[PDB]
Write a protein that binds this ligand. Sequence first.
Ligand SMILES: [Cl-]
Ligand SMILES: [Cl-]
Ligand code: NA
Lengths: 6, 102
Amino acid sequence: PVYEPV
Amino acid sequence: GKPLHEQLWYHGAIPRAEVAELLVHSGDFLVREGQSQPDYVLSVLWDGLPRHFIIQSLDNLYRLEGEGFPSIPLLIDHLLSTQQPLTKKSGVVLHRAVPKSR
Ligand SMILES: [Cl-]
Ligand SMILES: [Cl-]
Ligand code: NA
């Protein structure tokens, strides 16, 4: 799954 | 303060498919348990698509890319009160808290 780059 | 799991916008172990059904307008958000990983996630609708931000936990603080807060409710209330973007790269802003279906 893709997550926001944080 | 009121524990995270009692907040109206904390949904626990809901999967991404359910997040997409629950968020309707840009800036709608919820916090949930991770699905594929164990950290909490702030999921926010932006221009029709959910965006998923892992809330980092370290040194007794919670953060995205800015300040560290002593709890997730404090982080959320700060984002709502300042309207600052969750990250500079995303431009996403919290506007309103989606209640748990239960
Ligand atoms: Cl909790
Ligand atoms: Cl899913
Ligand atoms: Na607030």
